[PDB]
A paper describes a structure:
Among the important Type I PRMTs is [name] ([name]), which regulates multiple aspects of transcription by methylating diverse targets including RNAPII, SRC3, C/EBPβ, PAX3/7, SOX2/9, RUNX1, Notch1, p300, CBP, p/CIP, Med12, and BAF155. The requirement of [name] is implicated in multiple cancers, with its methyltransferase activity particularly addicted by hematopoietic malignancies and metastatic breast cancer. Mechanistically, [name] methylates Arg1064 of BAF155 and thus facilitates the recruitment of the BAF155-containing SWI/SNF complex to a specific subset of gene loci that are essential for breast cancer metastasis.
Given the tight [name] binding by 1, we solved the X-ray structure of [name] in complex with 1 (HSF) with a resolution of 2.00 Å. However, the [name]–1 complex is distinct for multiple configurations of its ligand and interactions via its 6′-methyleneamine moiety. In Chains A and C of the [name]–1 complex, the carboxylate moiety of the ligand forms an ionic bond with Arg169 and a hydrogen bond with Gln160 (Supplementary file 1-Table B).
Numbering used by the authors:
A (entry chain A): 143 to 476
B (entry chain B): 144 to 477
Amino acid sequence: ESSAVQYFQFYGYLSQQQNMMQDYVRTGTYQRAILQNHTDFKDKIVLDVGCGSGILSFFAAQAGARKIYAVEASTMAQHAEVLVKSNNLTDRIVVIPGKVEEVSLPEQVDIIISEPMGYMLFNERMLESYLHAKKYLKPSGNMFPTIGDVHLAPFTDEQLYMEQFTKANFWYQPSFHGVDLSALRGAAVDEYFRQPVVDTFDIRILMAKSVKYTVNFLEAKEGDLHRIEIPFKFHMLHSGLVHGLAFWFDVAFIGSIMTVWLSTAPTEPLTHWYQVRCLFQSPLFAKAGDTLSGTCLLIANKRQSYDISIVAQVDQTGSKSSNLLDLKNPFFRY
Amino acid sequence: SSAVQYFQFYGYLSQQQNMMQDYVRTGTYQRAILQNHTDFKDKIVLDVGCGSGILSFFAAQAGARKIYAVEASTMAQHAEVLVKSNNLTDRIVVIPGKVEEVSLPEQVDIIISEPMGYMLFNERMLESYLHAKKYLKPSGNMFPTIGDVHLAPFTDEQLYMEQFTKANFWYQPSFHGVDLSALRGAAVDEYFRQPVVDTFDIRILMAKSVKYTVNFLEAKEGDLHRIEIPFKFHMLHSGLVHGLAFWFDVAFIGSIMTVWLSTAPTEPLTHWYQVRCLFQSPLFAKAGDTLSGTCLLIANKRQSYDISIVAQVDQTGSKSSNLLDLKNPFFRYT
Ligand SMILES: NC[C@@H](CC[C@H](N)C(=O)O)C[C@H]1O[C@@H](n2cnc3c(N)ncnc32)[C@H](O)[C@@H]1O
Ligand SMILES: NC[C@@H](CC[C@H](N)C(=O)O)C[C@H]1O[C@@H](n2cnc3c(N)ncnc32)[C@H](O)[C@@H]1O
């Protein structure tokens, strides 16, 4: 409820915009996607969903768009309008303060642009507002990004596991200043392992080819994203302990001229999204040739995020791990 | 509304652990309670905001007959588990709820609490601690008994320049084609509004500190809604005053012994560090000059304070006026 207030306050700070804008892979790929697909913009009507500082709307204008509606719900809207004026684009970019679910637009649009992707793609639940915005999209219209692929792969990383395990085991102490805390170990492990780990890693820690789950933004309905079910079956390529699942995502800007990809894969140049790892509370032993199967379930919550459920098992042994994660509250290990 | 987020934060075992592991903090509380055993032996105790229960366990180690441990977060349930597993059900009673809303079955001899935040007053929990005196027997004691806030002018060219280094990101005429320069002034203002949390060498301090004292035995809840701290500094060192540094001490004034808990820069580091409020316009002062003004802390709806600092060099008449948001500190400690 009031969780939404804090969400939009976060985006009101220029300090946050600076960090975002300094992701050169993010900013550069968006610009390339838009400019190299200029025919998708030339003399067209554009909607920018959550424009922030206005940067994507400026790209749209660079690509020759006739009119851009730049919708922003935080007080960043005021700073956007300052930039539109100072950059002499008042005749083309129209900042509209407010939520995209609530504002009126005078016109339907040829193309929607946005950066709705959060950590693990889904965090922030902005994909829903992005899909909601399709009420303004003409029949023959496009969305940038067009689709999104989430990848997941099993990883081995004892150092990470043991760091999180060691923190939780503070609550295994039997005489902390003479007090037995040990009755709370189970609660601590639950809590610490509930946090997804945001950082990057060497790809050599991945034990199988990634499973991918695609969302088509042209086709999906807002309601589809309330419950996201991702089944998986990994064919294990290396033997060892599986400490959890690594997550990343790519998005594609499928234009009339080119498809441009923005990847957050660990094989690609680093972005501010990094990668996301969900640890198992207890690792699963797998041998090469084994199959690790189960289900990643994402359930939309009232905190602009998802409750994550990961159930995984080594088919050959019946060894099973069940995990609950709180995507809203990641551990930023970088 | 932001009270809900406040209590959610303390519902995490990791946040409780953060404070428990502050050795200076937790060890000093234990030593103040145990070394003043006669203030506790066979006595009735109220622990305001018991969290994990750790201070209530210390009161039990010191021989208290009965300890009412009040906790408003869901941490109350975990504290209860610890009381059971430590076989202290007969002596420690966990009462879930806000100290302003629950009922106690009897009046107490002594109130213990750790309600300090940054610059002493952040989080406004001292209002709850003072509110709790409605449960205190006449001539009952409080641990801590008094609190001192210290302020002193500092010089720190590196810290000051940093603000411009960061804000100057906006001072560029073609960021991917966009003139960002019109936002530089707003970016500067933003950074100066955040109090800086980290530690420093005492050599940066330009004058003897002044102190503002709260006597918890005497103070009323309402006294903390507006805190006016006048200051006159007779300058020890010539230089540019880049702002005011803040720290605090509390004293536990027991029957046997007074024990001090200090967060001073001359003392070992605690989880509170120290806090510096910068001046966007610095003040030049020579040794022997007097730097006078007022630091006014005005309580706000976000469990924090709006900080207004006005300072002048009496000899030159040159002044600096500053507004900071204590709810949004910059954590600089690296
Ligand atoms: N993480 C990227 C960020 C900026 C991207 C931008 N393109 C930048 O680079 O500046 C998303 C933006 O979307 C806004 N936002 C989120 N939801 C909504 C909404 N429902 N209605 C309007 N704005 C929203 C939110 O306040 C934020 O400023
Ligand atoms: N300062 C940190 C901590 C000390 C923990 C422990 N004592 C430690 O020293 O380790 C304060 C505790 O007070 C609770 N709290 C804050 N306000 C209230 C209130 N009005 N009513 C009940 N609980 C409150 C709050 O949820 C938190 O658990």
